[PDB]
Symmetry: C4
C-alpha cells in the first residue's frame, strides 16, 4: 500500500516494501505507530518537512546524502530523532560533514591559594592583580635594558683606558641585576606555591623559561672569578637574554606565535631538510666551479656553505662572489632556487598565524557577548 507521510503537512508517499528496508530505526520499525493516527492512516509527524527528504532518499537509494545550506545543528537533531547515525553517511558527501561539525564545535567551544592562582592568570579581574602584573613586567624591561647597556663603551676617562660601562660601574650594575633577579625568583616562588598541579607547572614551558632566566645569576655566584676561564662565562651572559621571553605573559602575540610554530612542526622540519640538501648541492657545485682561482675563498665545501646560504636568501653581502663563468651561472640558479624553496613554509605559517589570531579575537568577542546575555 502507498503509505503516505504528511510530515508537518508536507505529503510524501512510498511503498512499505522499501520503507521496511532497514527497520532498525524509527520509521522502518513499528514504534512509529505511536504517531500513527489512523483517523488519516498517515503517520502525521511534527518534524521539519525538509530533513525527511534525505530520510526517504536513504530508504530509496540505500544511503543518505547531506545538503549544504541548512544549519548542521538541526540536521544532527533530526537525524538523531529518527535514530539514524552520522556514521552511515555515504562518502558521496562526508568530508564537508566533518568540516561543518569541526567548525561548529570550535564556535560553541580558595581562601589564600586559589586567590593567588586566579589573580596570576587573569590580571584584569582584580586590581592588585594589575599592580603585580605591571610591576613584574616593568622589572623585565629594566633587566633587558641594563643587560643591553652594560656593554656600551662609555666614558673616555683620560686617566685610564677605554672601558665598557658594565665593568666600570661594577657594583652599580650588580645591584640592578640582583634586584631584578630577586624579584624574579620571588614571583616565581609565588607562581609555584599557588600552582594547584605543582607537577604540571614544573613541566610547563613558562617555568622552564623562568628557571633558565634565573639560574645564570646564581651559577655566576658559584663560579666566582677565582675559579673560572673567561670563555666559559660568556655563555652565562648570553643566556641572560632569555629573560626577555618572560614578556610571553604580558604579550598575546608571542603566545599565539608559539602556538602557530608548534602547530606547523612538520612543514618546518621539511623546510630545514630541504634547505640543508639544497645548501649541500649548491655548495658542492660552487666549490668545484670556484675551486681554482686567484684568492678563491671557496677553500672548502663547508666554506661554501656561507656563500650558498647568503645567496639563497637574497641577502648578498658580497664578500664571497664567484669569478668564473660556471660559478656565475650556478650562483644565478642558486638565488632562484633558494627563493623557491624558502617560499614554501611562509604561506601556511602566516595563514595559521592570522587564523589563530582572529580565532582568539572572535572567541573572546563571542564569550563577552554570551556573558552579556
Amino acid at each position: 500500500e502507498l503509505i503516505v507521510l504528511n510530515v508537518s503537512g508536507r505529503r510524501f508517499q512510498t511503498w512499505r516494501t522499501t520503507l521496511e528496508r532497514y527497520p532498525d530505526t524509527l520509521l522502518g520499525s513499528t514504534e512509529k505507530e505511536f504517531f500513527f493516527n489512523e483517523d488519516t492512516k498517515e503517520y502525521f509527524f511534527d518534524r521539519d518537512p525538509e530533513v525527511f527528504r534525505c530520510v526517504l532518499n536513504f530508504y530509496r537509494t540505500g544511503k543518505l546524502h547531506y545538503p549544504r545550506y541548512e544549519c548542521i545543528s538541526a540536521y544532527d537533531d533530526e537525524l538523531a530523532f529518527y535514530g539514524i547515525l552520522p556514521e552511515i553517511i555515504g562518502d558521496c558527501c562526508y568530508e564537508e560533514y566533518k568540516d561543518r561539525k569541526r567548525e561548529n564545535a570550535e564556535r560553541l567551544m580558595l581562601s589564600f591559594r586559589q586567590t593567588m592562582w586566579r589573580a596570576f592568570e587573569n590580571p584584569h579581574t582584580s586590581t592588585l592583580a594589575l599592580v603585580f602584573y605591571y610591576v613584574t613586567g616593568f622589572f623585565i624591561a629594566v633587566s633587558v635594558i641594563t643587560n643591553v647597556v652594560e656593554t656600551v663603551p662609555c666614558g673616555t676617562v683620560p686617566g685610564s683606558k677605554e672601558l665598557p660601562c658594565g665593568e666600570r660601574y661594577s657594583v652599580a650594575f650588580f645591584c640592578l641585576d640582583t634586584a631584578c633577579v630577586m624579584i624574579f625568583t620571588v614571583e616565581y616562588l609565588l607562581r609555584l606555591f599557588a600552582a594547584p598541579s605543582r607537577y604540571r607547572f614544573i613541566r610547563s614551558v613558562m617555568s622552564i623559561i623562568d628557571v633558565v632566566a634565573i639560574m645564570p645569576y646564581y651559577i655566576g655566584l658559584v663560579m666566582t672569578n677565582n675559579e673560572d676561564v673567561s670563555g666559559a662565562f660568556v655563555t652565562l651572559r648570553v643566556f641572560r637574554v632569555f629573560r626577555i621571553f618572560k614578556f610571553s605573559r604580558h604579550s598575546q602575540g608571542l603566545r599565539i606565535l608559539g602556538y602557530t610554530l608548534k602547530s606547523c612542526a612538520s612543514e618546518l622540519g621539511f623546510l630545514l631538510f630541504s634547505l640543508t640538501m639544497a645548501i649541500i648541492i649548491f655548495a658542492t657545485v660552487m666549490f668545484y666551479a670556484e675551486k681554482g682561482s686567484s684568492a678563491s675563498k671557496f677553500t672548502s665545501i663547508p666554506a661554501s656553505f656561507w656563500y650558498t646560504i647568503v645567496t639563497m636568501t637574497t641577502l648578498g653581502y658580497g664578500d664571497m662572489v664567484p669569478k668564473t663563468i660556471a660559478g656565475k651561472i650556478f650562483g644565478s640558479i642558486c638565488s632562484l632556487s633558494g627563493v623557491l624553496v624558502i617560499a614554501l613554509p611562509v604561506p601556511v605559517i602566516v595563514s595559521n598565524f592570522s587564523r589563530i589570531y582572529h580565532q582568539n579575537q572572535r572567541a573572546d568577542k563571542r564569550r563577552a557577548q554570551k556573558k552579556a546575555r
Copy 2:
C-alpha cells in the same frame, strides 16, 4: 487539534500545544485570529512559504536557525512581521547572521560661507573649484621641487668655491619660497573661515599637516642668522618636507593608505614589539660571538643593532659581516627569522588596503548608479 497553516498555500500542520509554547509573538498569541477565516479553520497567511519553516522549527526545537541562501533582508522583514527578535537566534547559526547584516549595512551605506565649504571638498562640482584645486596643487609641486633643487651643487664659478644653488641664488629661491608659503597660508585661512565646525577643523589631521608645513617659514624669520646655531635650523629645512603631504587632498590613494594604516594599529604595534625583541636577541648573540676579532665592528650590542636590522630585512650592505663560525651560523639563522617576523603584517596590510580601495570603488559606482535611477 491538528491546527493547519496554509501559509500562502503551503500547508504545514502542528498541535496547538506546541504552538502555545511561546505566546509572546504573533502566532503563539491570539491576535493571529484576525487572519483566521474559519471558513477553512486554518490561519491563511499571505507571507512567504519558506520563512515560516524556521518559525515552526523554532516552535518545535525551542530555537530558530538561519539558512544561508535567501536574502537576509526578506528574512529580517518576515521575522519582524511575526514579532520575533534576532537576539533569540540560537548560536547554532549566529555569527554569519551578524556577518550578513554587517555587509548589508555597508552595501546600503549658504550665501558665501557654505558656497566655499562645498567648493573646497568637492572640486569637480563647480568649475571655479577646479581652478582653485589645480592651482593650489601646482604650487605644492613647485615648493617640493624647489626644496629638492636648492641643495644641488651647480655652478663651477671658477672665481669662488663650489656652492649649492640654494645659497648662490639666495633671493631667487627666497621669493619662490615666500610665494608658495603665502598661497599656502591664504588658502588655509580660507579653509578656516569657511569651516562650519571650526573646532573640528583645527583638531583634524589635515589642519595639523598644513600648519606644520607652514610654520617652518615664519619660525625661520624670527630666528634670523643673527641669533642662531647652524645645528638648530637643519630641523627647519627637514620639516619643510612635510608640505609634500598636502597631496593628500589631491590623491585618493594616500588617504586610503592612511585609513588602512590607522585601521591596523594593533598588528603594527605587535610588529614593532616583536621586531624590537628579535633585534635585541640576535644582537646579543652576534655581539658575544663576534666580540673578539681582528677589527670586529661589533664593538657593542647597540653597534650590533645595525648588523641585525640590515640582515633581518635581507638588505645585506656588507659593511658588517661575521667572521667566526658562530657568527656565521647565527647570521644565517637571523636572516630567516627576520624574513619570518616581517612577513606577518604584510598580508593583512595589503589585504585591508585592497579591500578599502575596492570598497570605495564599488561605493561610488553604486552611488552614481542610484543617482542615475
Copy 3:
C-alpha cells in the same frame, strides 16, 4: 477572494487586492486570463514552482529578492516570462546579481587577400602558415643573438689592439643584419597589404613595434659615418633591442602580460606616485642626517635618491651606507617602508595575471568542447 495559483502543481494563494498592486505585468494585469481555466478557477501555470515564490514575495513586499543557488539563466528566463524587469530588483540583493550576469556573459562569451589574412593570425590552421610563422620567428632569434654577440670582445689578434667582434668582422655582421631586416620589412609589408582595416593596423601596437624595430637600420644608412657624432648612434643600437618584442606574436604569455599591465594602469600610476614621494621624503631625511661626514657621498638630495631607491628595494649594494646614528635609524625605517609600499601592487598584478591566464585556458577549452559537440 483568495485567488489560488497552482503553478505547475505548487499551490500558492493570495488576495487579488495585493495581486493588483502592480498590474503592469503578466499576473497583475488581465492577460493571464488566457491560462485561467475556470474548470478550477485557478490560474494553472506550467512554469517553475520555485521562481514564482519571488514573484508573489514582490507582490507582498513591493520588491523582489534574488536567491543564490539556482542558475541565473532560468531566473532571467522566468522573470522575462512574467514581464518583470531586472532593473526593479531591490538593492537588498543587487550587486551579486550583476556579478552573476557578468561572469555568465564571460562564460558564454578571399581569393588571395583573406587567405593571407587568415594564415597570419592563425598559424596552426594551414601548414604554409607554420612554415611562415616558424621561419619568421627564427630570424628574430638570429637578429637578437647577433646583436648581443657583436659586442663580445673576442680575438686577441696580437698584431693589433683588442677589438669587439662587431667591428672586426664588419661586413660579416652587416650581412646578417641586412638579411634579418629585409625579411622583417617584407613580412611587415605582407602584414600591411593583407590587412582589411589598413588604418586599424597602422594604429595597432604591433605595427608600431615592427616599424620601430626596423627603422634603426635605414636611419643608420642615411646617417653614414661621414656626417655623425658617435654619441647619437648609440641610441640606434639601443633601439635595435626592440626587435626582441616581436616574440609577442609567438608567445602567449607576453600578450597576456601586456593585457594585465594595461588592465592595472591605476594601481601602477599610484605605485609610481607613492614611490616618488617616499623617495623624496627619505632622501631629504638621509641627506640632512648624513650631510656632514668624512667622505659623505650624500652630496645632494638627488645624490641621495640612489641610496633611497637601493634601500627601499632591499637591494643593498653597499656603496652608499650611512655612518651616523640618525642615518642608521632612518635607513632602517626606509627599508621597511619600501618593503611596505612596494608590496601593494604585486598582489593585484599577479592575481590579474593568473586570472587572465586561466580565463584564456578555460576559454579555449570550452571552445574546443563546443566545436566538438
Copy 4:
C-alpha cells in the same frame, strides 16, 4: 489533459503536449506507464521530489539547469534514473558541473619475488622492511657526509704542506666510498630483480637517479690516474652529489615537490623565457649606458648579464654597480621589473605544493578511516 505527477507526494502538473517534447527518455516515452496506477491517473513516482523540478523545467525550456547545493551524487543517480544524459546539460550551468564531478572523483579516488616487491614500496608493513629502509637510508647520509668532509683542509702536518683530508687519508676514505657504493648497487639489484615490470623500472626516474649516483664510482676505476687529465674527473666528484637525491624514497616532501614541479612545466617555461628576454633588454641598456667609464666592468653585454641577474633578484652583491645617471635610472627600473617578473610563478607554485600536500594528507586520512570501517 493536465497530467499530474505526484512524485513521492509532491504534486506537479503539466500538459502532455510539452511532456511529449522529447519522448526518448523515461517520462517522455510510454514505458513510464508501468508506474501509472490509474487508480489515481497520476504517475506516482517514488523518487526525490526536488530533482524532478529540473526535469520538468527541461521539458518546459528545452534545457535543464544544475542547482548548486545538493550532492551531485544523487543528482547523477536521479538523472540516470530518468535516462537523461549529463551531456545535454545546457551551458547555462556546465563548468561547475564538471568541477564537482572532478573533485568528487578525487574524493572517491609471491613466494619470494612479490614478498620483496611489497616490502620495498611499503616499509611500515613488515619489520624487516624497516630494518632495510633505515639501514639503506643511513648509508646515504654516510656517503653524503664523507663526500662533504673529504674536502675540508684539516691537519697542519708541519713536516709537509697543507692537505685536505680526502687526499691525506686516501684509503680510509676509499673504503667508506666503496662500502656505501657496494650497498647501493646491491640494493639496486634487489630493486631490479624484484620489479615485476622490469622495463617500467629502468624507464623510471628513481632508477636513473640510482644508476647516475652509482656509475661515478666504477667510471672512476676505469679512468685510473694513469690515463686522465685532472679537469675531466672534477665532473665525477660533482656527479657524486646526486646520491643525495636517493632521499626521495625516505622523504615525502621531495616527491611532492617533484610532482608539483612537473605539474607546473608551462609556467616554469614561461618564467625562463620572460626572464631571459628581460635580462637581454636590461643588459643591453645597462651596457650602452655604462660602456664608457673609468674601470667600467660592463665590458660586454654578456658581462652585463651578471649585473642584471644580480639586480633583478634583489641580491645586490655590489661588485658591479652603475656610475652614470642613466645607469642608475635603469638599474633602479631593473630591480622593480625583476621583482615583478619573478613574482609570477611563485604564487601558483606554492599553491600547487600546498594543495598536493594537503590532498595526500586528507587522502591517507580518508583511506585509514575507510579501512577502519
